[PDB]
Amino acid sequence: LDLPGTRILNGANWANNSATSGTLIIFDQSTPGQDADRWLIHNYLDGYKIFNMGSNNWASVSRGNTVLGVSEFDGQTCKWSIEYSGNGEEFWIRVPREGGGGAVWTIKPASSQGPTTVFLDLLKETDPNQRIKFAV
């Protein structure tokens, strides 16, 4: 009787991750492998931890403002703040920083013509690329 986990969505697209320092979290509409689109989000200290059921990677703050899946958990890069955006059922996934202010998940191509992956930029409260939805 095992848990389904959740999809992480931006518009119609969902977060995927594959195995293998750190792999890209790709937002699109093609699931690469079994449960690569399913995530276990748990309370962790004052925030949350975000695990991919397909790849077994944790979403972590990575080298140079990107969000990657890494195989070993690190409390200092794998803890997230999840805050309500103010409309609909969309939230911000945010880097934990004392007295707030951290960078947020920002879904955009690396250059142009894809693929669309996760970066960490300053919060623009009006930016669609930073609005996340969860569906079980």
């Binding site: 009787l1 848990l3 389904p4 986990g5 959740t6 999809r7 992480i8 995530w39 276990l40 989000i41 748990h42 309370n43 949350y48 999840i82 805050e83 309500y84 955006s85 103010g86 059922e89 939230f91 969860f134 569906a135 079980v136």
Partner: protein, 391 residues
């Protein structure tokens, strides 16, 4: 960080005292008088006061405002605080019931200091022993006319209590209704038009009390058998704790039996269209004072199941609906926060901290004979008792 909550949940200090059966409770003049007086105080408090009856009832559903927070959120998810259809249903409601109980108890304390008779010490002792009573809705002593609720709860417009100079007085019954002052601006439909809480409405939006009582008596043998099945056929937390991801699929859960009880008070099933009063509606139920007797029994049944099924506690489950303090899609466990309930150390309560109900300063009269006994002995005895009382 900074301080988070203005009113920590701490429960009741001192010796552990029992929550009594409402039938027994009303027979005690000291407990009954203090309850009515304490309830008068809570209800008369300004509705913006977090220690008010209105705000305490407000946590559960509407209004969708933060409760007792020292610092507001930037963007508030406007929803119920209560968690329903989740592994956390039983434990969240345990915490909620104690938040109410402590607020009532603090009010009862100030009340007892006003008695001026030669038995004032007895009134003072009574106030600290005072706990919230329960309606044992699963008990049916094979008597067609039996009702598990006394007239003081469901009929009497005025009740007799003892005044401070020892004299007998009648007061408007604060248990029968809550009168809004004012009606919550964000209530819609019939609820926008109802000045007081309403039980078992008819087509004309008036209270049908005798219809409600008739329905309770008729349902009662069905509830005996159902409560018994709920206590004795569930062996895992998942099946026991909640009504399912499709509401109804866990037909035998504590939550599902508890749902039907709400509809016994709040909603005539024959009406078409349906016309629920406060207790038949999740966003409005907690404003009716009988909510607390109902939930006091849900916590009791939890306590009984826990005893028979020791060390079988919260198991991991999905959170599907966003609630004011829970992320849609997140996994729920025994270490998940139970907003808006904080400890005096300014940490959120977890199911973890309240597995042992005695930590909040209460017990139930059911457990009197097994005090200090082993988990295994307690489990055997209570299993016999459940078979005697609900079999």
């Amino acid at each position: 960080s900074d301080k988070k909550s203005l009113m920590p949940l701490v429960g009741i200090p001192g010796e552990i005292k029992n929550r009594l059966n409402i039938l027994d409770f009303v027979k005690n003049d000291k407990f009954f008088t203090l309850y009515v007086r304490a309830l008068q105080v809570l209800q008369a408090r300004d509705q913006s006061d977090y220690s008010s009856f209105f705000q305490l009832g407000g946590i559960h559903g509407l209004p969708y405002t933060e409760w007792a927070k020292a610092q507001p959120q930037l963007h508030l998810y406007k929803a119920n605080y209560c968690t329903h259809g989740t592994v956390l249903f039983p434990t969240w409601h345990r915490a909620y019931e104690s938040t109410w109980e402590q607020t009532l108890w603090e009010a009862a304390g100030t009340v007892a200091q006003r008695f001026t008779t030669s038995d004032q010490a007895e009134w003072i002792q009574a106030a600290k022993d005072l706990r919230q009573p329960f309606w044992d809705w699963g008990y049916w002593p094979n008597d067609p006319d039996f009702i598990g609720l006394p007239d003081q709860v469901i009929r009497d417009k005025q009740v007799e209590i003892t005044d401070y100079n020892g004299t007998k007085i009648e007061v408007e019954n604060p248990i029968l209704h809550y009168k809004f002052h004012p009606i919550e601006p964000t209530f819609e439909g019939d609820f926008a038009q109802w000045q007081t809480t309403m039980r078992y409405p008819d087509v004309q939006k008036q209270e049908n009390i005798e219809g409600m009582i008739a329905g309770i008596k008729a349902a009662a043998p069905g509830f005996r058998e159902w409560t018994f099945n709920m206590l004795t056929k569930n062996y895992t937390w998942e099946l026991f704790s909640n009504h399912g991801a499709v509401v109804g699929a866990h037909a035998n859960s504590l939550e599902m039996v508890h749902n039907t009880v709400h509809f016994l008070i709040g909603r005539d099933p024959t009406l078409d269209p349906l016309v629920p009063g406060h207790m038949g509606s999740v966003p409005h139920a907690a404003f009716d004072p009988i909510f607390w007797m109902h939930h006091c029994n849900v916590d009791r049944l939890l306590a009984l199941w826990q005893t028979m099924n020791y060390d079988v506690y919260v198991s991991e489950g999905m959170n599907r609906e966003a609630t004011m303090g829970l992320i849609p899609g997140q996994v729920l466990t025994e270490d998940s926060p139970l907003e808006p309930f904080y400890t005096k150390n300014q940490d959120p309560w977890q199911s973890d901290d309240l597995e042992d109900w005695e930590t909040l300063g209460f017990s139930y009269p059911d457990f009197d004979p097994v005090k200090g006994k082993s988990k295994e002995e307690k489990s055997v005895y209570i299993n016999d008792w459940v078979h005697k009382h609900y079999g």
